[PDB]
Design a protein around this ligand. Structure first.
Ligand SMILES: C=CC1=C(C)[C@@H](Cc2[nH]c(/C=C3N=C(/C=C4\NC(=O)[C@H](C)[C@H]4CC)C(C)=C\3CCC(=O)O)c(CCC(=O)O)c2C)NC1=O
Ligand SMILES: C=CC1=C(C)[C@@H](Cc2[nH]c(/C=C3N=C(/C=C4\NC(=O)[C@H](C)[C@H]4CC)C(C)=C\3CCC(=O)O)c(CCC(=O)O)c2C)NC1=O
Ligand SMILES: C=CC1=C(C)[C@@H](Cc2[nH]c(/C=C3N=C(/C=C4\NC(=O)[C@H](C)[C@H]4CC)C(C)=C\3CCC(=O)O)c(CCC(=O)O)c2C)NC1=O
Ligand SMILES: C=CC1=C(C)[C@@H](Cc2[nH]c(/C=C3N=C(/C=C4\NC(=O)[C@H](C)[C@H]4CC)C(C)=C\3CCC(=O)O)c(CCC(=O)O)c2C)NC1=O
Ligand SMILES: C=CC1=C(C)[C@@H](Cc2[nH]c(/C=C3N=C(/C=C4\NC(=O)[C@H](C)[C@H]4CC)C(C)=C\3CCC(=O)O)c(CCC(=O)O)c2C)NC1=O
Ligand SMILES: C=CC1=C(C)[C@@H](Cc2[nH]c(/C=C3N=C(/C=C4\NC(=O)[C@H](C)[C@H]4CC)C(C)=C\3CCC(=O)O)c(CCC(=O)O)c2C)NC1=O
Ligand SMILES: C=CC1=C(C)[C@@H](Cc2[nH]c(/C=C3N=C(/C=C4\NC(=O)[C@H](C)[C@H]4CC)C(C)=C\3CCC(=O)O)c(CCC(=O)O)c2C)NC1=O
Ligand SMILES: C=CC1=C(C)[C@@H](Cc2[nH]c(/C=C3N=C(/C=C4\NC(=O)[C@H](C)[C@H]4CC)C(C)=C\3CCC(=O)O)c(CCC(=O)O)c2C)NC1=O
Ligand SMILES: C=CC1=C(C)[C@@H](Cc2[nH]c(/C=C3N=C(/C=C4\NC(=O)[C@H](C)[C@H]4CC)C(C)=C\3CCC(=O)O)c(CCC(=O)O)c2C)NC1=O
Ligand SMILES: C=CC1=C(C)[C@@H](Cc2[nH]c(/C=C3N=C(/C=C4\NC(=O)[C@H](C)[C@H]4CC)C(C)=C\3CCC(=O)O)c(CCC(=O)O)c2C)NC1=O
Ligand SMILES: C=CC1=C(C)[C@@H](Cc2[nH]c(/C=C3N=C(/C=C4\NC(=O)[C@H](C)[C@H]4CC)C(C)=C\3CCC(=O)O)c(CCC(=O)O)c2C)NC1=O
Ligand SMILES: C=CC1=C(C)[C@@H](Cc2[nH]c(/C=C3N=C(/C=C4\NC(=O)[C@H](C)[C@H]4CC)C(C)=C\3CCC(=O)O)c(CCC(=O)O)c2C)NC1=O
Ligand SMILES: C=CC1=C(C)[C@@H](Cc2[nH]c(/C=C3N=C(/C=C4\NC(=O)[C@H](C)[C@H]4CC)C(C)=C\3CCC(=O)O)c(CCC(=O)O)c2C)NC1=O
Ligand SMILES: C=CC1=C(C)[C@@H](Cc2[nH]c(/C=C3N=C(/C=C4\NC(=O)[C@H](C)[C@H]4CC)C(C)=C\3CCC(=O)O)c(CCC(=O)O)c2C)NC1=O
Lengths: 177, 164, 372, 177, 177, 177, 164
């Protein structure tokens, strides 16, 4: 939709201004961590199935009120929905890590997620705890501090992208709160 | 809009999957290409008033009919509207050098040109004469790099091909 | 592109390789349907010319797209074969739907849930149930775009209603499979001068078709009903309910308030010390990251968060059925109106000055990660 | 920068308040023990949805007449309101741990709450036990002596922060009684 | 849907009355200006492309806030829509001038125009100015007072049809206000 | 303040109160050696959850008849109620340590304990054995002579408060003799 | 199949337009990446018999219960079926290192795996025990270059995430 390149044109389209050398170096700075961004998305979708299955079962293991009958994640259909429901959030945050800004998931995934989960009857406080596990493991992979899985990388700093994906995962949490 | 990123992200979403190793491979070209086209953007933005002044009147030099009364250029202010009409086109090819695709040119300058230039009697052959006067005036040693002159000319003739 | 005679492509059912094209368009559905006599007549391939077949495919399948002359050349590819007879108009809207001009105004710009509801509006001309969504939302998860549009065109609901020669339209059939399915179809299909492009969130049928109860509002169904079937009830009676809805349907006033999410709050005079009813249920929404040296641990004030009424149905209804065997041995009658209550000192930790202790009595029960 | 935090928590005209990179160490130099105090709130708000679901269910399993007919946590209009009200106390006390002052807690959260709960018929016998669980739940997460979850931290003592929230939860226990 | 002959039959359907010689001569007068209405519709659709293109450019030339970026007629696609949006208004008032009553445009053009322009962000005060130019020009044609184009007619009275099309152009203005 | 602390205890309802730091130095001046005595309560109640879970577990290993079927700690309704009487001795001796008297220990707790243990079938010779472990546990905590958990302290002598709590624990045991 | 070329040439065709400057730029990424992955394919094709002998047996070292009677490993020949049944996967990682995308991995190895491995009672966990044993044994000095081992690991875990 809007990537990091097209975010600075719609700010400049309202001013009718040509993009010049005062903010092109801010955009040329974004290309300088091009390969730093590129390995970071590859480390996310490397362990993406083990990402969501540790996240939903961790939400179950601290709050075992959904497995009880009458719960939302009780039956075998709704757990298959809930493993799919957290998988779409991982799929669209990975688009925003590739696009560089929260604009693809905002109008597709988050637009109308709040009343979808209210009308179906999703416990919204448990959905905060669902994606907060997916926030703390997304920064665990792209800083490579994951204990059971260590991936080889070229050495350097990557903490600027760690504040990027952690600004996306609470945008999901604010859109569902 | 229609960039190289929005091409591969929407195609990975229309398949309904994660970003695969083809899609991470497509963005790796942009490190090799943004070093050439972004300095063509600031060469356009640092010289945008000259390339509308001494190239917007070349349509009037070729088409000297339309300053007659009863026609598309009547008075002095519609000529001032006309230099406003071509300044948006030079803004948009600056807006597509910074994106990397042809994204901001289509829905903002191209889509709907067959409607508004037919009802308001604006001759599109006088549009493309001013744009192709800018197209053949590129050269290596004065204007930009030898590589940026390929892609800056590669956006201008797409405006020629879509208007004609 | 394929052949000058092609009834069906892609070989989904086995009996389409032997299936002819329909020699004539299919008949109307045989129930009574009092509404459709006021409706305009359906447009088919073999009664009308290409000027109006293209307009009604734009008026129904494209919603109201405003396709320009340089816009949609993929439709101009698919229309140039339909005029040559190279594919039927059933297969033509499959080629319209799989094209990117349908994608770049309904798939990328609308939401994930709204893309299914617009597909039932365009292709089938109705609005789905929740089980029809839940079988269509998995094709967007596992198989993608092209298989999901195959679920409409190769369905038996399409081939009985339209067949190979009839342009899609709102089929009033009178006797429906559900009473909701009439009036959810009608709410999904307004008349002229409406499009789908401004409502990037649709947000009203996205929450009536979400839960299986809470059928939609009556003025949202009296609006697109036909004429001498609405009048003497839309002069000024429901007319202000229509205008107040249209300013809410336009700009997408999100129906947390009045449709679903239905909480009897206390009156404003009941608290009055936790006052200023704009700021009554607001909390600090705090978030920390603590990674490296780029954090932005930004505290926000949150909105008026409501009791969600289903996490309070997981809690307090499913579990907390632990009020069993509560005779609690009523021996020792002098206990001065309290149970076993420890004094509960609880020293607030002595950071050497300006930090002090207070105490509080409470009834104490031992937990379930306790003895043996 | 704390006046930017204090004006957004009394609901003035800002929508939210973001803290940058250079401002975050400027906030850490402002308050005392700025590395541990941001780790204490990060332990609280990551488990806020588990804590108020346990403390309400801890309140029910002590006094089971609340979900009897005639109780206050019967008719789940009310039970979702009580599950809301536990979160609002936890979200205001986690700000006061972050700010270091109870001054926001007394004027935004606690004045008239004794008058609100006698006007709503909320029983003060069980409402103190709702807070007294959440004092013990917050003080176990801070020194990392929770039974199930052991979260990784830089090692050291945090008992000066652990007695800080016990003073802050006692002000909730004072203003309700 | 409803023409002028079918308008009096639903006025007579509510009374269950045979339509007779007390109001057939009011409808015989409608056929007396049968050709006067018939030449009037032809003069609207004669210069129909020059009707709307002068009308929307007259709305632009008095208010250049739309050509400014952020305006609703800034880009090239929106000017192509706004040339076509006012053309449909001409296309349905020419239907209702032919049908003799405002019934064909009130349900195909006006039913749903208000919330489409609200959710798009169309300035409603500018479209009031846009169609009131078309009110002043449609009465300029059917009174033959157009200065740049005079058409030959049989001479006579036509101001009864002048208030007819002027009543239609305030019906499109009321439904958008 | 101590009369206000008397209003915490005797009210026959759940109540809570704290003391601010301006009011705290008046309380340290009113009591003698109060920095030991505020450390005396805080040594006990920070380890109270292990103190009652080891003393009544030590009662079982000296008298295994209570886990016989029909014995008084056989079911978990009775086992949780034995720890519920274990903690409520320990809070009421801690406030008696805090106030420095025993009058709140007799009037609020021990008046009516012999009349309610014989009526409930509670073994009084076994619960004296349970509280004598808690006499022996608390003198290790007050002299920092615990073998597992040793706490940091401002050094000095607090054997006067060691004899103060042993005069409080035998007053429990003489009340149920 | 689903390459970086056939992604951007089908999305240009579904839009119904010419290859624009966004589509021409995506092939410029293949100049910078084919030096890395085509060396990894020659390291895989020159060592394919080794990486199924001392890495296909590691599933049986993890799952010795499969060689029990009445299971998916009964006799000697189904184990000789099994090393062929793993060598077709390592041919397919070689078939997608030279494409650039996940094209030949999907419809030849993935699409339909949930059907044949469930009906014929084959445990997919013992597939991914053999595949991820090859994944963690990559290193820079012995095996390949430093960049080839990133991409060769990036196609293995896609097969783990598809089967699990
Ligand atoms: C097709 C697959 C494919 C990719 C996915 C990318 C991955 C990639 N990354 C780097 C190179 C690098 N990548 C990183 C990134 C990181 N290092 C870390 O320790 C962090 C964990 C992580 C950040 C989140 C760093 C720090 C460098 C070296 C500096 C740099 O070139 O950016 C390089 C070499 C660039 C050079 O040195 O010239 C390549 C080729 N490239 C590919 O061909
Ligand atoms: C009660 C049951 C219970 C669980 C199921 C787990 C679930 C779980 N895992 C983590 C925390 C984590 N989870 C992972 C995920 C993974 N680690 C890997 O190496 C794999 C690739 C992947 C799982 C397959 C990572 C990387 C962390 C961060 C800590 C770490 O590096 O181990 C957290 C903390 C989240 C947070 O800090 O906000 C939780 C709740 N923990 C529990 O207490
Ligand atoms: C970003 C686009 C861009 C341009 C194309 C030029 C456009 C341009 N060219 C000239 C001026 C000129 N331009 C040229 C052309 C050339 N000169 C050479 O050395 C090459 C052989 C050849 C490149 C095609 C020549 C020979 C003149 C001087 C004579 C003349 O005015 O025509 C002038 C007037 C004087 C000046 O400003 O230099 C302008 C505005 N400027 C711009 O900002
Ligand atoms: C996807 C691939 C694809 C194509 C290759 C074209 C192929 C094609 N062309 C036409 C249709 C046509 N094609 C031509 C073209 C020509 N006849 C001549 O005399 C010239 C030699 C030649 C132009 C250079 C003409 C004239 C028609 C219309 C036939 C008629 O009705 O008179 C049709 C039928 C649809 C229609 O009539 O509009 C199709 C499918 N269209 C496609 O969709
Ligand atoms: C297009 C983007 C897109 C999304 C953002 C998600 C959002 C989403 N979730 C569900 C649907 C659901 N989502 C959940 C998920 C959960 N409930 C819980 O208790 C957990 C907290 C959480 C899992 C982490 C459940 C249980 C259902 C099914 C409800 C039911 O019918 O019982 C539905 C309805 C379709 C269906 O029922 O399958 C949608 C649209 N799905 C999408 O397609
Ligand atoms: C952006 C957000 C942000 C945060 C979340 C914190 C995170 C954080 N904490 C510490 C650092 C620390 N954090 C703790 C805290 C604890 N250790 C324990 O054993 C207890 C369980 C817990 C008490 C609550 C301690 C003891 C240190 C070491 C510094 C010190 O002793 O004060 C550090 C510096 C060293 C390190 O990286 O570990 C950082 C960045 N700071 C931030 O800027
Ligand atoms: C105000 C101060 C105060 C107390 C001192 C206690 C006193 C006390 N204990 C019990 C009730 C009980 N007390 C015990 C305790 C014991 N039985 C044994 O075998 C052990 C010797 C000993 C634990 C160490 C048991 C087992 C019961 C429950 C008896 C039963 O359920 O039949 C009851 C009955 C009420 C109930 O529990 O429902 C009361 C008032 N409670 C108070 O509120
Ligand atoms: C019969 C009804 C009944 C209950 C519902 C529970 C309720 C309950 N939980 C805890 C106590 C606690 N509750 C939590 C909270 C959590 N622990 C986790 O590991 C999760 C992350 C998170 C949500 C479950 C913590 C951290 C403690 C303190 C240590 C512990 O017990 O784990 C306490 C002790 C509080 C105190 O001593 O004052 C009680 C009464 N116990 C009961 O007797
Ligand atoms: C500023 C801070 C702030 C708060 C503290 C809460 C305080 C609060 N609670 C309620 C309202 C309520 N609060 C409760 C809560 C409880 N009843 C019990 O039995 C438990 C002890 C307790 C939950 C733990 C209930 C049950 C209601 C609803 C009353 C009713 O419907 O009868 C209301 C009335 C308004 C409404 O609910 O719409 C308010 C202001 N809200 C705030 O904005
Ligand atoms: C298919 C094409 C076609 C038409 C468009 C109509 C036009 C038409 N108009 C009139 C005839 C007329 N038409 C007008 C109308 C007008 N004169 C004016 O000065 C006004 C500008 C304008 C009214 C808006 C008048 C005033 C007469 C003469 C009186 C009358 O016959 O109505 C007549 C002759 C009737 C007669 O005199 O007997 C015809 C044939 N008929 C057609 O066959
Ligand atoms: C064949 C003949 C025959 C017997 C000899 C008794 C044997 C006997 N006594 C008790 C059971 C018991 N016995 C006692 C008795 C005592 N505990 C004390 O602490 C006192 C000092 C002492 C009595 C003086 C108590 C308190 C119980 C448990 C009460 C109960 O089981 O209801 C039980 C357990 C029954 C059960 O599990 O419910 C049995 C089998 N019953 C018989 O059928
Ligand atoms: C039959 C089984 C069996 C037991 C359950 C224990 C029970 C037990 N514990 C202690 C004794 C004690 N128990 C504790 C309590 C604790 N220690 C800590 O550090 C924790 C905080 C806390 C729970 C583990 C302490 C501090 C002492 C004193 C240690 C000492 O005597 O030096 C004593 C000696 C006191 C006495 O006899 O009165 C006994 C019998 N011993 C047993 O033989
Ligand atoms: C706000 C809450 C609050 C507390 C938790 C306590 C904490 C506390 N205790 C002492 C201080 C002390 N505490 C003790 C007590 C002991 N020392 C030992 O080594 C024995 C194990 C134990 C006997 C029980 C002694 C002996 C002193 C020093 C003399 C005194 O000030 O009483 C001091 C003064 C330390 C100093 O300034 O240097 C403080 C703040 N006081 C408070 O105001
Ligand atoms: C196409 C990919 C490919 C591979 C990864 C290897 C895989 C591999 N490695 C070893 C053999 C070995 N592999 C290693 C591992 C390593 N050795 C080092 O220098 C690094 C530190 C570390 C890379 C992770 C070691 C130490 C041995 C010798 C000991 C052993 O046999 O395990 C063997 C058996 C004997 C041999 O042929 O060497 C095989 C098949 N071969 C391949 O064809």
């Amino acid at each position: 939709m809007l990537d990091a390149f097209s975010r600075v044109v719609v700010n400049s389209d309202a001013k009718a201004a040509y993009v010049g050398g005062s903010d092109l170096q801010a955009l040329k700075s974004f290309i300088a961590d091009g390969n730093k961004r590129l390995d970071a998305v590859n480390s996310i979708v490397s362990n993406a199935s083990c990402m969501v299955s540790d996240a939903v079962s961790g939400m179950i293991c601290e709050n075992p009120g959904l497995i009880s009958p009458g719960g939302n994640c009780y039956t075998n259909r709704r757990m298959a929905a809930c493993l799919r429901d957290g998988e779409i959030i991982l799929r669209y945050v990975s688009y925003a890590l590739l696009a560089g800004d929260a604009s693809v998931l905002e109008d597709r995934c988050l637009n109308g997620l709040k009343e979808t989960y209210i009308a179906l009857g999703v416990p919204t406080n448990s959905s905060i705890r669902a994606v907060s596990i997916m926030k703390a493991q997304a920064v665990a992979f792209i800083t490579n501090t994951a204990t059971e899985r260590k991936m080889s990388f070229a050495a350097g700093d990557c903490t600027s992208l760690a504040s990027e994906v952690a600004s996306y995962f609470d945008r999901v949490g604010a859109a569902i709160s | 809009m229609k960039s190289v990123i929005t091409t591969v992200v929407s195609a990975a979403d229309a398949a309904g999957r994660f970003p695969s190793n083809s899609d991470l491979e497509s963005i790796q070209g942009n490190i090799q290409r943004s070093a050439a086209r972004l300095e063509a953007a600031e060469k356009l933005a640092g010289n945008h008033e000259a390339v509308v002044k001494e190239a917007g009147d070349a349509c009037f030099a070729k088409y000297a009919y339309l300053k007659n009364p009863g026609e598309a250029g009547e008075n002095q202010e519609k000529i001032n509207k006309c230099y406003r009409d071509v300044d948006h086109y030079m803004r948009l090819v600056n807006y597509c050098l910074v994106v990397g695709g042809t994204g901001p040119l289509d829905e903002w300058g191209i889509a709907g040109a067959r409607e508004v230039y037919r009802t308001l009697n604006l001759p599109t052959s006088a549009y493309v004469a001013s744009i192709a006067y800018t197209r053949d005036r590129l050269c290596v040693p004065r204007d930009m790099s030898a590589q940026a002159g390929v892609e800056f000319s590669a956006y201008l003739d797409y405006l020629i091909n879509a208007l004609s | 592109l394929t052949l000058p005679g092609t009834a069906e492509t892609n070989l989904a059912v086995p009996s389409n390789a032997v299936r002819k094209v329909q020699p004539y368009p299919i008949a109307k559905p045989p129930s009574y349907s009092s509404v459709d006599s006021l409706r305009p007549a359906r447009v088919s391939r073999m009664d009308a010319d290409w000027a109006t077949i293209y307009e009604q495919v734009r008026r129904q399948v494209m919603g109201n797209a405003y396709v320009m002359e340089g816009e949609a050349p993929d439709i101009d590819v698919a229309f140039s074969q339909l005029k040559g007879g190279n594919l039927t108009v059933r297969e033509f809207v499959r080629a319209v739907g799989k094209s990117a001009s349908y994608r770049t105004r309904f798939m990328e710009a609308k939401s994930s849930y709204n893309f299914v509801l617009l597909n039932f509006k365009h292709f089938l001309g109705r609005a789905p149930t929740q089980e029809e969504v839940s079988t269509h939302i998995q094709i967007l998860a596992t198989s993608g775009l092209e298989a999901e549009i195959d679920s409409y065109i190769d369905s038996d609901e399409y081939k009985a209603l339209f067949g190979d020669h009839v342009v899609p339209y709102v089929v009033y059939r009178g006797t429906y499979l559900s009473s909701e399915r009439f009036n959810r179809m009608v709410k999904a299909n307004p008349g002229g001068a409406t499009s789908d492009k401004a409502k990037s969130n649709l947000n009203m049928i996205a929450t009536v078709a979400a839960d299986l109860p809470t059928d939609a509002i009556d003025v949202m169904r009296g609006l697109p009903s036909p004429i001498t079937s609405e009048t003497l009830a839309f002069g000024t009676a429901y007319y202000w309910a229509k205008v107040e809805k249209e300013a809410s349907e336009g700009r997408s006033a999100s129906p947390i308030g009045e449709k679903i999410g239905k909480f009897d709050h206390a009156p404003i005079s009941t608290y009055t010390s936790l006052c200023s009813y704009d700021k009554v249920n607001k909390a600090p929404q705090i978030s920390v990251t603590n990674v490296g040296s780029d954090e932005h641990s930004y505290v926000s004030v949150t909105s008026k968060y409501i009791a969600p009424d289903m996490a309070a149905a997981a809690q307090m209804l499913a579990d907390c059925q632990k009020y069993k065997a509560g005779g609690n041995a009523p021996t020792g009658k002098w206990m001065k109106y309290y149970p076993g209550t420890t004094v509960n000192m609880a020293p607030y930790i002595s950071l050497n000055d300006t930090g002090s202790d207070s105490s509080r009595t409470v009834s104490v029960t031992l937990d379930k990660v306790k003895i043996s």
